[PDB]
Design a protein around this ligand. Structure first.
Ligand SMILES: Cc1cnccc1NC(=O)c1cccc(-c2nccs2)c1
Lengths: 39, 156
């Protein structure tokens, strides 16, 4: 049995930590909502 | 139940201790998460109940108490923030430039950030604090890392 707990406001924060790259990927989406890499 | 706008953890007691299975967004009295988090099950908020209203396994989205409310979109240019709510850790904003998922039905923004599966449903924000989609559905690359779509639903 599942329940929810509040964790915060939804707000842009100036000088967050900045990270991650920006990959361009060919992908396919199947009927079960699973993405896969096309090559 | 608690109906204040904001980000919420999704918990179960059906395993060892209390386990965080994912995250979601309360906006305009509607609770928004990913389908793979709840599998469409009911939720508790205090002694209040949240019943599913809309869902789609293919979009991997579900709404509670009413229709999907989040309609903002990635501009295709600007840096965004994942409001990550990891299991047992405080909400933390992480700012990133989304890559692109290229699909036969069109391009989708994507964010390349590693977080445990229980973070599924954390919202992705634009510079104005608008939810442009959820984090948790995508693809595992060579790195063993995860790249998530920016999943968004339609507002009617
Ligand atoms: C469970 C499920 C079912 N169906 C669709 C998607 C998913 N989602 C994941 O599997 C998932 C979500 C966030 C992150 C990660 C990883 N982080 C790093 C390594 S894999 C996986």
């Amino acid at each position: 049995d599942m329940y929810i707990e509040r964790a915060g406001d939804i707000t842009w924060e100036k000088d967050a930590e900045v990270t991650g790259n920006s990959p361009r990927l060919d992908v396919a989406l199947d009927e079960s909502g699973d993405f896969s890499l096309v090559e | 139940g608690e109906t204040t706008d904001g980000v919420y953890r999704v918990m179960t007691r059906r395993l060892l201790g209390s386990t965080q299975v994912g995250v979601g967004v309360m906006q305009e009295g509607v609770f928004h998460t990913m389908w793979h988090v709840t599998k469409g099950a009911a939720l508790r908020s205090g002694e209040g109940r949240l019943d599913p209203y809309w869902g789609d396994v293919k979009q991997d989205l579900v709404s509670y108490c009413g229709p999907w409310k989040l309609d903002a979109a990635w501009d295709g240019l600007s840096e965004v923030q994942l409001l990550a709510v990891p299991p047992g850790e405080r909400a933390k904003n992480i700012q990133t430039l989304p890559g692109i998922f290229k699909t036969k039905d069109g391009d989708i923004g994507a964010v390349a950030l590693d977080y445990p599966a229980g973070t599924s449903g954390s919202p992705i924000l634009d510079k104005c604090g608008r939810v442009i989609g959820l984090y948790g559905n995508g693809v595992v690359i060579k790195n063993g890392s995860y790249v998530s779509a920016i999943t968004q639903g339609k507002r009617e």
